[PDB]
CSV table of C-alpha atoms in Angstrom, one decimal:
chain,number,residue,atom,x,y,z
X,1,UNK,CA,18.5,-11.6,10.3
X,2,UNK,CA,14.4,-11.7,9.5
X,3,UNK,CA,13.0,-8.8,11.6
X,4,UNK,CA,9.8,-12.1,12.4
X,5,UNK,CA,13.3,-13.2,14.3
X,6,UNK,CA,12.6,-10.6,17.3
X,7,UNK,CA,9.1,-9.4,17.1
X,8,UNK,CA,9.0,-8.0,20.1
X,9,UNK,CA,10.6,-4.4,18.5
X,10,UNK,CA,10.4,-4.7,14.4
X,11,UNK,CA,9.6,-2.0,14.5
X,12,UNK,CA,12.6,-0.2,16.1
X,13,UNK,CA,14.2,-1.5,13.5
X,14,UNK,CA,12.6,0.7,10.3
X,15,UNK,CA,12.9,3.7,9.4
X,16,UNK,CA,11.0,6.2,11.8
X,17,UNK,CA,10.6,9.0,9.3
X,18,UNK,CA,7.7,6.5,7.6
X,19,UNK,CA,4.2,7.2,7.7
X,20,UNK,CA,2.3,4.6,9.8
X,21,UNK,CA,-0.2,3.9,6.9
X,22,UNK,CA,3.4,3.4,4.5
X,23,UNK,CA,3.9,0.0,7.4
X,24,UNK,CA,2.4,-3.4,6.8
X,25,UNK,CA,0.9,-4.5,10.2
X,26,UNK,CA,-0.4,-7.2,12.0
X,27,UNK,CA,-3.1,-6.9,13.3
X,28,UNK,CA,-5.6,-9.2,16.1
X,29,UNK,CA,-9.3,-9.1,15.1
X,30,UNK,CA,-10.8,-9.1,18.4
X,31,UNK,CA,-8.1,-7.9,20.9
X,32,UNK,CA,-9.5,-9.3,23.7
X,33,UNK,CA,-11.4,-13.0,23.8
X,34,UNK,CA,-9.0,-14.9,24.4
X,35,UNK,CA,-10.8,-14.4,28.2
X,36,UNK,CA,-13.0,-16.2,26.7
X,37,UNK,CA,-13.3,-20.1,28.6
X,38,UNK,CA,-16.3,-21.4,27.6
X,39,UNK,CA,-16.8,-24.2,24.7
X,40,UNK,CA,-19.4,-23.3,23.2
X,41,UNK,CA,-19.3,-19.6,23.0
X,42,UNK,CA,-15.8,-19.7,22.4
X,43,UNK,CA,-16.4,-21.3,18.5
X,44,UNK,CA,-17.9,-18.6,17.5
X,45,UNK,CA,-16.9,-15.7,19.9
X,46,UNK,CA,-13.1,-16.2,20.4
X,47,UNK,CA,-10.8,-15.2,17.8
X,48,UNK,CA,-7.3,-15.0,20.0
X,49,UNK,CA,-5.8,-17.1,22.4
X,50,UNK,CA,-3.1,-14.6,23.7
X,51,UNK,CA,-2.8,-12.3,26.3
X,52,UNK,CA,-2.4,-8.5,24.8
X,53,UNK,CA,1.8,-8.9,26.1
X,54,UNK,CA,1.9,-12.0,24.5
X,55,UNK,CA,0.3,-10.7,21.5
X,56,UNK,CA,2.3,-7.4,21.5
X,57,UNK,CA,5.4,-9.7,22.2
X,58,UNK,CA,4.1,-11.6,19.0
X,59,UNK,CA,4.5,-8.9,16.7
X,60,UNK,CA,0.6,-7.8,17.0
X,61,UNK,CA,0.6,-3.8,16.4
X,62,UNK,CA,-3.0,-3.0,15.7
X,63,UNK,CA,-5.5,-4.1,18.1
X,64,UNK,CA,-9.4,-4.1,17.9
X,65,UNK,CA,-10.5,-3.4,20.2
X,66,UNK,CA,-14.7,-2.8,20.1
X,67,UNK,CA,-16.9,-2.2,23.1
X,68,UNK,CA,-20.0,-1.2,25.2
X,69,UNK,CA,-20.7,1.2,27.8
X,70,UNK,CA,-21.0,-1.0,31.8
X,71,UNK,CA,-21.2,2.6,33.2
X,72,UNK,CA,-20.7,6.6,33.0
X,73,UNK,CA,-17.2,5.8,33.5
X,74,UNK,CA,-16.7,2.1,32.1
X,75,UNK,CA,-16.4,0.9,28.9
X,76,UNK,CA,-15.9,-2.9,29.0
X,77,UNK,CA,-13.9,-5.0,26.1
X,78,UNK,CA,-17.3,-7.4,24.0
X,79,UNK,CA,-17.7,-9.3,20.6
X,80,UNK,CA,-21.0,-8.3,19.9
X,81,UNK,CA,-23.5,-9.2,22.6
X,82,UNK,CA,-20.6,-11.4,24.2
X,83,UNK,CA,-18.8,-10.3,27.1
X,84,UNK,CA,-14.8,-10.3,27.7
X,85,UNK,CA,-13.7,-10.6,30.9
X,86,UNK,CA,-12.5,-6.5,31.5
X,87,UNK,CA,-12.8,-3.0,31.0
X,88,UNK,CA,-10.6,-1.3,28.5
X,89,UNK,CA,-8.4,0.2,31.5
X,90,UNK,CA,-7.5,-3.5,31.0
X,91,UNK,CA,-5.6,-2.8,27.0
X,92,UNK,CA,-4.1,0.7,28.0
X,93,UNK,CA,-2.4,-0.9,31.5
X,94,UNK,CA,-0.5,-3.5,29.4
X,95,UNK,CA,-0.4,-1.0,26.2
X,96,UNK,CA,1.5,1.1,28.8
X,97,UNK,CA,3.1,-1.6,29.9
X,98,UNK,CA,5.4,-3.3,26.8
X,99,UNK,CA,5.4,0.9,25.1
X,100,UNK,CA,7.3,1.3,28.0
X,101,UNK,CA,9.4,-1.9,28.0
X,102,UNK,CA,9.7,-1.6,23.7
X,103,UNK,CA,9.7,2.7,24.0
X,104,UNK,CA,10.6,2.6,20.0
X,105,UNK,CA,7.2,0.7,18.7
X,106,UNK,CA,3.9,2.1,18.5
X,107,UNK,CA,-0.2,0.7,18.7
X,108,UNK,CA,-2.7,1.7,16.9
X,109,UNK,CA,-5.9,1.1,18.9
X,110,UNK,CA,-8.6,0.4,17.3
X,111,UNK,CA,-11.9,1.6,18.9
X,112,UNK,CA,-15.8,0.9,18.2
X,113,UNK,CA,-19.1,0.5,20.3
X,114,UNK,CA,-20.2,-3.3,19.8
X,115,UNK,CA,-23.6,-3.3,21.8
X,116,UNK,CA,-26.0,-1.4,23.5
X,117,UNK,CA,-25.1,0.8,26.9
X,118,UNK,CA,-26.1,-0.6,29.8
X,119,UNK,CA,-29.1,1.2,31.1
X,120,UNK,CA,-27.6,3.0,33.8
X,121,UNK,CA,-25.4,4.9,30.8
X,122,UNK,CA,-26.7,8.4,30.7
X,123,UNK,CA,-23.0,9.8,28.0
X,124,UNK,CA,-22.6,8.1,25.0
X,125,UNK,CA,-20.2,5.9,24.2
X,126,UNK,CA,-17.5,8.6,22.8
X,127,UNK,CA,-18.3,11.0,25.9
X,128,UNK,CA,-17.4,8.5,27.6
X,129,UNK,CA,-14.5,7.5,26.2
X,130,UNK,CA,-13.5,11.1,25.3
X,131,UNK,CA,-13.6,12.2,28.7
X,132,UNK,CA,-13.0,8.4,31.0
X,133,UNK,CA,-10.2,7.3,28.8
X,134,UNK,CA,-9.0,9.9,25.7
X,135,UNK,CA,-8.8,12.8,28.4
X,136,UNK,CA,-8.0,10.5,31.7
X,137,UNK,CA,-5.4,12.5,33.9
X,138,UNK,CA,-4.6,8.4,34.5
X,139,UNK,CA,-3.7,7.7,30.9
X,140,UNK,CA,-1.5,11.5,30.5
X,141,UNK,CA,1.0,10.7,28.1
X,142,UNK,CA,0.3,7.4,26.2
X,143,UNK,CA,-2.1,8.8,23.5
X,144,UNK,CA,-0.8,10.2,20.3
X,145,UNK,CA,-2.2,13.5,20.8
X,146,UNK,CA,-0.6,15.4,18.0
X,147,UNK,CA,-2.8,17.4,14.5
X,148,UNK,CA,-1.0,15.7,12.3
X,149,UNK,CA,-2.9,13.8,10.1
X,150,UNK,CA,-0.6,11.0,8.9
X,151,UNK,CA,1.6,10.3,11.5
X,152,UNK,CA,5.6,8.9,11.5
X,153,UNK,CA,6.4,5.9,13.2
X,154,UNK,CA,9.1,8.7,15.0
X,155,UNK,CA,6.3,10.9,16.3
X,156,UNK,CA,4.1,7.6,17.7
X,157,UNK,CA,6.6,5.3,18.7
X,158,UNK,CA,5.6,4.9,22.7
X,159,UNK,CA,1.9,6.5,22.7
X,160,UNK,CA,-1.4,4.5,21.0
X,161,UNK,CA,-2.7,6.1,18.0
X,162,UNK,CA,-6.5,6.0,17.8
X,163,UNK,CA,-8.2,4.3,15.4
X,164,UNK,CA,-11.7,5.8,15.4
X,165,UNK,CA,-14.6,3.7,14.4
X,166,UNK,CA,-17.0,5.2,16.6
X,167,UNK,CA,-18.5,8.2,14.7
X,168,UNK,CA,-17.6,11.3,14.8
X,169,UNK,CA,-15.3,12.7,17.4
X,170,UNK,CA,-14.3,15.6,19.0
X,171,UNK,CA,-10.9,14.0,20.6
X,172,UNK,CA,-8.8,16.0,17.7
X,173,UNK,CA,-5.2,13.3,17.0
X,174,UNK,CA,-5.1,10.3,15.1
X,175,UNK,CA,-7.1,8.0,11.5
X,176,UNK,CA,-11.1,9.2,11.6
X,177,UNK,CA,-10.2,11.5,14.2
X,178,UNK,CA,-12.7,14.8,13.5
X,179,UNK,CA,-16.7,15.0,13.6
X,180,UNK,CA,-17.3,12.6,10.9
X,181,UNK,CA,-15.9,9.8,11.4
X,182,UNK,CA,-15.0,7.1,9.4
X,183,UNK,CA,-18.0,6.2,6.7
X,184,UNK,CA,-17.9,2.0,7.9
X,185,UNK,CA,-19.7,0.0,4.7
X,186,UNK,CA,-21.3,-3.3,6.6
X,187,UNK,CA,-19.7,-6.6,5.1
X,188,UNK,CA,-17.9,-5.1,2.5
X,189,UNK,CA,-14.2,-3.9,0.5
X,190,UNK,CA,-15.1,-0.7,0.7
X,191,UNK,CA,-12.7,3.3,-0.1
X,192,UNK,CA,-13.6,6.4,1.9
X,193,UNK,CA,-12.3,9.7,2.5
X,194,UNK,CA,-10.9,10.1,6.6
X,195,UNK,CA,-9.2,13.4,8.3
X,196,UNK,CA,-10.9,16.0,6.2
X,197,UNK,CA,-10.1,14.5,3.2
X,198,UNK,CA,-6.4,13.9,4.4
X,199,UNK,CA,-5.8,9.6,4.1
X,200,UNK,CA,-7.6,7.5,1.9
X,201,UNK,CA,-9.3,5.1,3.5
X,202,UNK,CA,-9.8,1.0,2.2
X,203,UNK,CA,-11.0,-2.1,4.2
X,204,UNK,CA,-11.4,-5.2,3.1
X,205,UNK,CA,-14.3,-6.1,5.9
X,206,UNK,CA,-16.5,-8.8,4.5
X,207,UNK,CA,-17.2,-10.1,7.7
X,208,UNK,CA,-20.1,-13.2,6.8
X,209,UNK,CA,-18.3,-14.2,3.7
X,210,UNK,CA,-17.5,-18.1,2.8
X,211,UNK,CA,-14.1,-19.0,2.7
X,212,UNK,CA,-13.3,-19.3,-1.0
X,213,UNK,CA,-14.8,-15.5,-1.5
X,214,UNK,CA,-12.7,-14.2,1.3
X,215,UNK,CA,-9.8,-15.2,0.6
X,216,UNK,CA,-10.3,-14.3,-3.2
X,217,UNK,CA,-11.3,-10.2,-0.7
X,218,UNK,CA,-8.3,-10.9,1.0
X,219,UNK,CA,-6.3,-11.2,-2.1
X,220,UNK,CA,-8.2,-8.4,-4.2
X,221,UNK,CA,-6.5,-5.8,-1.5
X,222,UNK,CA,-3.3,-7.1,-0.7
X,223,UNK,CA,-2.6,-7.3,-4.8
X,224,UNK,CA,-3.8,-3.4,-5.1
X,225,UNK,CA,-1.1,-2.3,-2.2
X,226,UNK,CA,1.5,-4.0,-3.9
X,227,UNK,CA,1.7,-1.3,-6.1
X,228,UNK,CA,0.4,1.1,-4.4
X,229,UNK,CA,3.1,4.0,-3.5
X,230,UNK,CA,1.4,6.4,-2.0
X,231,UNK,CA,1.6,6.9,1.0
X,232,UNK,CA,-2.4,8.9,2.2
X,233,UNK,CA,-3.4,5.1,1.2
X,234,UNK,CA,-3.9,3.3,4.3
X,235,UNK,CA,-4.9,-0.2,3.7
X,236,UNK,CA,-7.0,-2.3,5.9
X,237,UNK,CA,-7.1,-6.1,6.0
X,238,UNK,CA,-9.6,-8.2,8.0
X,239,UNK,CA,-8.3,-12.3,7.3
X,240,UNK,CA,-11.6,-12.8,10.2
X,241,UNK,CA,-14.7,-13.9,9.4
X,242,UNK,CA,-17.7,-14.4,11.9
X,243,UNK,CA,-18.8,-18.0,12.5
X,244,UNK,CA,-21.8,-17.9,13.8
X,245,UNK,CA,-24.2,-19.9,15.6
X,246,UNK,CA,-23.7,-23.2,13.9
X,247,UNK,CA,-21.6,-25.1,12.2
X,248,UNK,CA,-18.1,-27.3,11.1
X,249,UNK,CA,-15.8,-24.1,10.5
X,250,UNK,CA,-14.7,-22.6,13.6
X,251,UNK,CA,-12.7,-19.6,14.4
X,252,UNK,CA,-9.6,-21.6,14.4
X,253,UNK,CA,-10.6,-23.3,11.3
X,254,UNK,CA,-11.0,-20.6,9.3
X,255,UNK,CA,-8.0,-18.9,10.7
X,256,UNK,CA,-5.8,-22.3,10.2
X,257,UNK,CA,-6.2,-21.6,6.2
X,258,UNK,CA,-6.7,-18.9,5.3
X,259,UNK,CA,-3.3,-17.1,7.8
X,260,UNK,CA,-1.1,-19.5,5.6
X,261,UNK,CA,-2.9,-19.4,2.5
X,262,UNK,CA,-2.1,-15.2,2.7
X,263,UNK,CA,1.1,-16.1,3.9
X,264,UNK,CA,2.3,-18.1,1.8
X,265,UNK,CA,1.2,-15.1,-1.0
X,266,UNK,CA,2.7,-12.3,1.2
X,267,UNK,CA,6.1,-14.5,1.2
X,268,UNK,CA,6.4,-14.5,-2.2
X,269,UNK,CA,5.6,-11.1,-2.8
X,270,UNK,CA,8.7,-10.5,-1.4
X,271,UNK,CA,9.7,-6.8,0.4
X,272,UNK,CA,5.8,-5.4,-1.5
X,273,UNK,CA,3.2,-2.6,0.9
X,274,UNK,CA,0.3,-5.1,1.9
X,275,UNK,CA,-1.3,-2.9,4.7
X,276,UNK,CA,-2.6,-3.2,7.9
X,277,UNK,CA,-4.0,-6.9,8.2
X,278,UNK,CA,-6.4,-8.3,10.9
X,279,UNK,CA,-5.6,-12.1,12.0
X,280,UNK,CA,-8.0,-14.9,14.3
X,281,UNK,CA,-5.6,-16.2,16.8
X,282,UNK,CA,-2.6,-13.4,15.4
X,283,UNK,CA,0.3,-15.7,16.8
X,284,UNK,CA,-0.5,-19.9,16.2
X,285,UNK,CA,0.9,-22.1,14.7
X,286,UNK,CA,0.3,-24.5,12.5
X,287,UNK,CA,3.0,-27.2,12.0
X,288,UNK,CA,4.0,-27.2,8.0
X,289,UNK,CA,2.4,-23.5,7.7
X,290,UNK,CA,3.5,-20.0,6.6
X,291,UNK,CA,3.6,-17.7,10.0
X,292,UNK,CA,1.2,-14.8,9.0
X,293,UNK,CA,2.3,-12.7,11.9
X,294,UNK,CA,5.5,-13.4,10.9
X,295,UNK,CA,5.5,-12.6,7.0
X,296,UNK,CA,3.8,-9.3,7.3
X,297,UNK,CA,6.2,-8.3,9.7
X,298,UNK,CA,9.0,-10.2,7.5
X,299,UNK,CA,7.8,-8.2,4.4
X,300,UNK,CA,8.8,-4.1,5.2
X,301,UNK,CA,11.4,-3.4,3.4
X,302,UNK,CA,13.7,-1.8,6.1
């Protein structure tokens, strides 16, 4: 039966000789915003309703963590200026928990600075992360620490792989884990080499697109992956967009239309390569419509 019928451990059912890049992974955009309760603020800043554990249980393996240095030793999880009511340790503890219960899954954790540090901070966001999280004895053995620029599932399962969106780092393990980091173009479909030129990263992140243009842009990169069997190529495809302060298309409205449209498209493509697709309201179902998380998972040929 479909891998999507057991999302708690779908990576356990793959050949762990595969590079993560070759694996079709569902991700959650601004994963940590499930904590938002304010109705007005939630229209444009709430991107998820399931907590980290439930997201994982629903089969999400790519986590989009954007944050802000709150103290010289603390990173708070943020959607821009909006604080999401927890620090990075919360997500790390939930991941460590889940990975222990499901030891043949891997988690790719993206890390980005979304907002200006607290006036008391004397450190860079990167330095705080490297020193107080990555190299923290508390999170010993949690992170992938190997030196493969293109790690395999075997090499990473049970661990969190860093997807570096912090700029240059002195961390030496994970995606964009060098002094160059990842050159990220603003509101664009783009292509850049990462990990000392080892990998070719292809990103659709047009987060300001109006609906029709967004679907076109997701589908464009979706099509390219389909006929791309190169393991040194990695695809990250965001289905999410910014809502804005006022209007009729609450992130939930947008998601309720694009998610099924892409899910339906993936399903028709059969077991073809999709890349890593990052969505709002991962695991959220609308009766009568295909589930994007489920179809991303099922698209993997075993």
